[PDB]
Amino acid sequence: AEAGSRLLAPLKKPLIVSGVLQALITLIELAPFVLLVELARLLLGGAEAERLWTLGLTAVSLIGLGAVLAAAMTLWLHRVDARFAHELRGRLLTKLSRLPLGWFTRRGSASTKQLVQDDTLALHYLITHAIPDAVAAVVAPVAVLVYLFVADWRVALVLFIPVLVYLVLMSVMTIQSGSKIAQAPRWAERMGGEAGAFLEGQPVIRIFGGAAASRFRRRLDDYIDFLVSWQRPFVGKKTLMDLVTRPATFLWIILVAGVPLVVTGRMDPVNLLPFLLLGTTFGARLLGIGYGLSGIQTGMLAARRIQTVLDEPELVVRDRTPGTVELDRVSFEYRPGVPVIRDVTLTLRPGTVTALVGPSGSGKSTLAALVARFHDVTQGAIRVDGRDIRTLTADELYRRVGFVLQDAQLVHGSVAENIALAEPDAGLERIRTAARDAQIHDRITRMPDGYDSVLGAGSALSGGERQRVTIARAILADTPVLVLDEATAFADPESEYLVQQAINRLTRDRTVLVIAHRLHTITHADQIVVLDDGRIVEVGTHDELLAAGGRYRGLWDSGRY
Amino acid sequence: GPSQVQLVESGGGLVQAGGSLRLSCAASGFPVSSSTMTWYRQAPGKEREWVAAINSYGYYTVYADSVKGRFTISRDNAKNTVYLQMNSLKPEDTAVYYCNVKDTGQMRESYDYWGQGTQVTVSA
Amino acid sequence: IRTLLRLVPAEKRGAVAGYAVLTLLSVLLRAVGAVLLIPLLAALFSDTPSDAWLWLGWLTAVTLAGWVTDTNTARLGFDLGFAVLSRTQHDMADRLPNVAMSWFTPDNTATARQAIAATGPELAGLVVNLLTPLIGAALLPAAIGVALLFVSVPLGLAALAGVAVLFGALALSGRLSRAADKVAGETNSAFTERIIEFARTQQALRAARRVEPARSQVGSALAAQHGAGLRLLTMQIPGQVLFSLAGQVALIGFAGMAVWLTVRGQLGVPEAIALIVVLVRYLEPFAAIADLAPALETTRATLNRIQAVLDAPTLPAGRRRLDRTGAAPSIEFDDVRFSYGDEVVLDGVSFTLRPGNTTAIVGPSGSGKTTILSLIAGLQQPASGRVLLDGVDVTTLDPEARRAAVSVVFQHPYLFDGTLRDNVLVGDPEADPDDVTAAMRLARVDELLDRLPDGDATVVGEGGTALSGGERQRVSIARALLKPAPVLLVDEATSALDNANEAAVVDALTADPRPRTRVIVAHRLASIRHADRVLFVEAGRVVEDGAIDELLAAGGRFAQFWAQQQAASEWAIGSTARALEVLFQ
Ligand SMILES: CCCCCCCCCCO[C@@H]1O[C@H](CO)[C@@H](O[C@H]2O[C@H](CO)[C@@H](O)[C@H](O)[C@H]2O)[C@H](O)[C@H]1O
Ligand code: NI
Structure with missing residues (x-):
């Protein structure tokens, strides 16, 4: 809860200004009504002077002042929101550039396209439209009933009985429902899963018989039979008669209470004229309150998620006071309770291939990611050529340590720009050499646009x-230390051979750390490090x-026949 | 040649309806436990249809729906023969029965080996 | 649209056809009760005060003669709203297995998931909470026009002449507000699509030492789009706030001329009120239902995606392959x-x-x-x-x-x-x-x-x-x-x-x-x-x-x-x- 309030903290003053100013505006917006009754009774008083134009345009002076004030604030409030969102995006860009790279690893393995936009739209409504629309729906009904309870008293109390007709019936409704108030949100949440599995099982239903068809409707029928079992019995007739005590019946029970005109009530008939115009639309005035605060909570939940991203710990920058990698009593844990790496010491000699x-x-996988500072170690240190990786900037580190992992990203640009992303000033000749070493050149030249073909969106x-x-990009980067995941070699079986030959050129004349999955591919490694539950148990040649x-003998034998 | 495939069938003959017969297929030139053996039948004028087949490992057996429950296929590796015991012989089973083995595995177009078949006539 | 008369369940076309006219006369009965406010209040004090509640006995006739017809429209709509709730999701469920799997795109599978899951109680109270409140509130400004005809025709056709100009005015205010939310959702999408791109490529950017050059190019592109947004707020809402001003300018306008350009009618202060009860529920609900009109029109369109565009495979069941059944075919x-x-x-x-x-x-x-x-x-x-x-x-x-x-x-x-x-x-x-x-x-x-x-x-x-x-x-x-x-x-x-x-x-x-x-x-x-x-x-x-x-x-x-x-x-x-x-x- 504090995360949301901390984010909106620099806005507490502009928001409370939006509340009282909007309250004055909606009071001005009901002013042409409080004077139209006066204009009527001023003619009843037999005035009808030639200077009646006075009160005629004071209404015009107020309908204009209300719209000018409404337009002035809704513009001032939208420009405060735009400046708040502009600084926030700058803070987000700064945050995404300082969080550990492992924080992004499958953080958005689904299209988060909409939930970032749905939050920014909810964040906009919370700052710009939430406060004005909220108080405008509560001061408008609370300023007329006090204006009607000074007109007549019983005719004002005659319209407090149709509202308690509605309220306590819904209180009886919220307790007659009982078991069906907490099931409806869950049954609506759990029924979307049966829909997704029914759409995924389509290729099975066409080929094999299966029961996914009947397995879905059984979950769909008891869901429609769920709310029909508690929204047809006690609503088909209960709110049937409270949704009729609100629309037009207010006018009828105004006049049957208006029949005691001056005969017993002893009040001027135009003291009922306020009830004529604002007592007819009172029922719809204090029901729209719950729809003004409905956006405030879904908005403050978005602000809490935005601050949570702004509260995430960053890559801590520390002080210093032939790639040779030294892992010295390394330990790591994602959550503060479950260990992942347990006191690992390892040395990667320059120019050698070490397999994990x-x-x-x-x-x-985690151990190799720590060499690229995807996460900071919790205990020990990792040094590259005597320098701890925590005492390096993103340029010093990633000039020494490169990585070819799964889900390698291509940036918006041409083929030649993606191959040379680590050294854009390099000539096209050097770009072409990396493409040939990565066995992608003949595929590039076969493209109509060649190296000018645009990657990033759709290729x-x-x-x-x-x-x-990306292998050509890593080759052109030419790092002394290279962290390689062997899973990239069989991620596309149709091109496994070509990716292998690219890895051959990539893993030469530099320190190589390999995440091995198929043991037969690392039989020629200079050093094979066997890991078990985070500890090193065996180190040696194949x-x-x-x-x-x-x-290792057990794993090697298990991978046979 | 010295490793020439050869299949011969036997066990056929005339037997009235409701009876039983046992067919045998003496294979030569290849192990019956290496490939899958299949029993076919073909009445005069009609196209041949498979009746039953047994796996190379020996456990997977499949039968045509018109004989399942009445026909049974089995194998004897020691004699390198294939058996087919057909009970409750209906006149629809009147045909010439063959055993089949195909030369797959070798990276070539598979070639089917057939025998001379044995006549099975069943009257009602 | 034809969206709803597609969802009409069989065996119930008579209950919706009767509903069509049984809810139509309610608009006629609330139109005569409004023009009955003209004489009732004109005699209550303006001239010859207190007339022993004559028209109240005739207004109490039309009020609870609308109570009887509306106590069934909601009840009929409650069962009619549940009948469409049942027939709809059942039809879409039984139709999806017979859809050409080429149709199952990543997006069409998302719209199909919305149509058969998040469309529960929205379809239940579909007719009673939006259809009947909209069908009624759309014909009332024209219903009083024919219900005022027997009191004054120069005042009657002036209503049918003024009902077409205010509908188009709101249709333009609803079109200006609809065209403004589009550009709003486009800039924020262009705002966030650069944040997402800088996030998914952070590994490649950091490894290539391109993190800061891309940091400034996105920070300035967002600072420039931030400027383009500021100028479009200045020249846009000078029109939006004008149209609720345009709602109250016609109120004091006619009531400001019926007071001075009349003089011969101080029993025409119900006329300022008769014109109010015509405009009480004009753009008051139309703005209150315009937020839920497309919020219920497109859930009838993502629902329209499944059945109207079935793209069912042809599968003419002419043959059964009863030749050599069980035989390996060519x-x-x-x-x-x-x-x-x-x-x-x-x-x-x-x-x-x-x-x-x-x-x-x-x-x-x-x-x-x-x-x-x-x-x-x-x-x-x-x-x-x-x-x-x-x-x-x-x-x-x-x-x-x-x-x-x-x-x-x-x-x-x-x-x-x-x-x-x-x-x-x-x-x-x-x-x-x-x-x-x-x-x-x-x-x-x-x-x-x-x-x-x-x-x-x-x-x-x-x-x-x-x-x-x-x-x-x-x-x-x-x-x-x-x-x-x-x-x-x-x-x-x-x-x-x-x-x-x-x-x-x-x-x-x-x-x-x-x-x-x-x-x-x-x-x-x-x-x-x-x-x-x-x-x-x-x-x-x-x-x-x-x-x-x-x-x-x-x-x-x-x-x-x-x-x-x-x-x-x-x-x-x-x-x-x-x-x-x-x-x-
Ligand atoms: C053993 C039987 C199983 C057969 C199942 C085949 C189902 C095909 C229906 C649609 O599925 C699409 O098939 C396309 C290929 O047909 C692919 O699209 C991709 O392929 C094309 C490029 O060749 C482009 O049209 C597309 O844009 C591109 O996304 C993509 O994998 C998949 O979404
Ligand atoms: Ni806005």
Whole structure:
């Protein structure tokens, strides 16, 4: 709750100004009504002077003042929102550039296109439209009933009985429902899952018989039989008669109470004239309140999520006071309770290939990500050529440590710009050499636009060809230390051979750290590090680890037949 | 040649309806446990149809819907023969029965090997 | 629109036709009660005060004569709103299985999920909460015009003349507010689509030292769009606030001239009130319903997406393939052309697969290989040409004949939440347990059953034990093996980390005793080396066709593919001896 209020804290003064100013405006908007009755009774008083134009345009002077004030604030409030959103986007851009790279790893594995826009639209309504629309729906009904309870008293009390006709019947409704107030939100949430599985099972239903068809309607029928079982019994006749005590019956019970005109009530008939115009639309005036605060809560939930992104811890910058990688008693944990890496010491000699193997839970993926500072270690240190990676900036680190992992991203631009993203000033000749080494050149020249083809949005090349472009980018970066995930070699089986030959050129003349999944691909590694539940248990060459008859021998034998 | 495939069928003959017969297929030149063996039947004038087949491992058996429950296929690796015990023989089962093995695996177009078949006549 | 008279349930067209006129007279009764305020209040004090509530006894006649007709419209609408609530989602549910799977785009599947889930109580109180309040409030300003005709015609036609100019004025205010929300949602989308792009490429940008150059270019592009937004607020809402001003300018306007340009009518201060009760619920609800008008018009349009654009496959049930049932049929492609929208996927393909053999389809991921299987399976239909199973057009097949003709192993396991045995029994629910045991064994699912304490009864959904990719595949292969279809198709996407899954595919193709014509889009030499015929598909055309040995002797596209797949299996990092400088092989 504090996250949302902390975000909107610099706006507390512009918001409370929007409340009292809007309150005065809606009071001015009901002013042409409080004087039209006067204009009527001033003629009843036999005035009809030649200077009646006076009170005729004071109404015009107020309908204009109300619209001028309404237009002035709705413009001042939209420009306060625009400046608040502009500074917020600048803070978000700064935040996304300082969070750990691992924070992005499958953070948006679904199209978050809409929920970022749905929050910015809800954030806009909360700052600009929430406060004015809220008080305008509560001071307008509360300023007329006090204006009607000074006109007549019983004719004002005659219209307090149709509102308690509605209210307590809905209080009886909220307790006769009972078990069906908490089920409806869950049954609407859990019924969208049966719909998604029914749409996913379509290719099965066409081929095989299956029961997904009847498995869905059974969940759909007891859902329609759910709300019909509690929105037809006690609403088909109860709110049937309270939705009629509000529209036009207010006018009828105004006049049957208006029949005691001056015969017993002893009040001027135009003291009822305020009841003529504002007592007819009172029922719809204090029901729209709940629809003004409905946007405030869904908006403040968006502000809490935005501050949560602004509250996330960043990559802490620390002080210093042939890539040789030194892992010194490294430990890491995502959550503050569950360990992932447990006191790991390792040295990657310059120019050698080190392979990370292990069963489930080994942590070989997490361990390699720490070498690229995707996350900061919780214990120990990771040094590259004697320098801790925490005492380096994003340029010093990623000039020494490059990585080719899954889901490699292409930026909006041409093929030549994506290959040279790490050194754009490099000539096209150097760009073409990296494309040939990555076995993507012949595919590029086959394209109609060649190296001028635009990538980023939609391309004619496949995922394996996308990978070879980023491999060309990594080759052109030419890092002394390279973190490689072998899963990129079989992510596209139709192009597994070409990606392999690209990795051959990529992993030469530099320190290579490989996340190995198929043990037969790292049999020539200079160092095979076996991981088990976050600890190192075996380190040696392929044949040494076969002779020890330990964990590597078991994994190697398991991968046969 | 010395490894020439050869299949011969036997066990046929005339037997009235409701009876039973047992067919045998003496294979030569290949192990019956290596490939899948299939029983076909073809009445004069009509196209041949499969009756039953047994897996190479020996556990997976399938039968045509017109014989399932009445026909049973089995194998004897020791003698390298294939059996087909057909009970409750209906006159619709009157046809010439063959056993079949196909030369797959070898990266070529598969070639079917057939025998001379055995006549099975069943009258009602 | 025709959106609602599409959702009209059968057996209830009389209850909505009566509702149409039974709710129409209520607008007539509230129109005479408004013009009955003209004389009732004109005599209450203006001239000859207090007339013993004569018109009140005639207004009490029309008030509760509207109470009787409206106590049924809501009640009828309550049941009518539930009748459409029931008929709607049932029809869309029974229609989706018969939709051409080409229609199931990533977006059309999202709109179909909204239509059959988030459309519950909104459709329940559809008619009573918006349809009847709008149908009534739209004809009342014209209903009093004919209900005022018998009091004054120069005052009556002046209402029907003024009702068309104010409707268009609001229709322009509702069009200015509708055209303003579009640009609003476009700039904020252009605002956030740059934040999303800078976020998804953060790894590539940081690794390429391009994080700060892109930081300033987006920060300035957002600062420039921030300026373009400020100037469009200045020249836009000077019109919006004018139209609620335009609502009160006609009030004091006519009441400001009926007071001075009259003089002959101080009983015309009900006229200022008669004109008010005409404008009390004009743009007061029209603005209060215009937020829920498209919020209920497009849920009738995303709902219109399913049924109006069914795109149901033709499937004329003319034939049932009752020739050689249970026999492996030949597969024929006769000038088959296919396109996804406008791009050509298959550009006139003609081949004939002989019955009983297995064919392997290879090619550079042109998505035509997978399309060839979909057309055989019947998930899609060819744009031009024919696909014949033993000379019988697959489109001319009965739904139950086309369903039981092809068995498919998709790239995805497509498993549902339930027991592992239930996911296999989908291929044939009435199959004897001997066939189920053989299918799970050939697919090597029994290797998985050992590590499961409950065996095949182990629930594999989210509330049960989890399976791996290779294990899920083996379950999918057993499901396809269990179905006794004379055709089997494999869109191979096997796990590279599961030797049992790799062996299960080979067994399903070579150790299946049932005669089947088998086609597989595969990439591993272990799965295609047993094929009798290979189709190399390139750019929507079959550029190579032949046996394995003869294609390898030709030295063409399949020969290079075979050698590359062979070398890919022998691959090891750092094992090419720096011979890459000469040959690039
Ligand atoms: C074993 C039988 C299973 C067969 C199932 C095949 C179902 C095909 C129906 C639509 O599915 C699409 O198929 C396209 C390929 O046909 C692909 O689109 C991609 O492929 C085309 C490019 O070749 C483009 O039209 C598209 O834009 C591009 O997204 C894409 O994978 C998929 O969304
Ligand atoms: Ni706005």
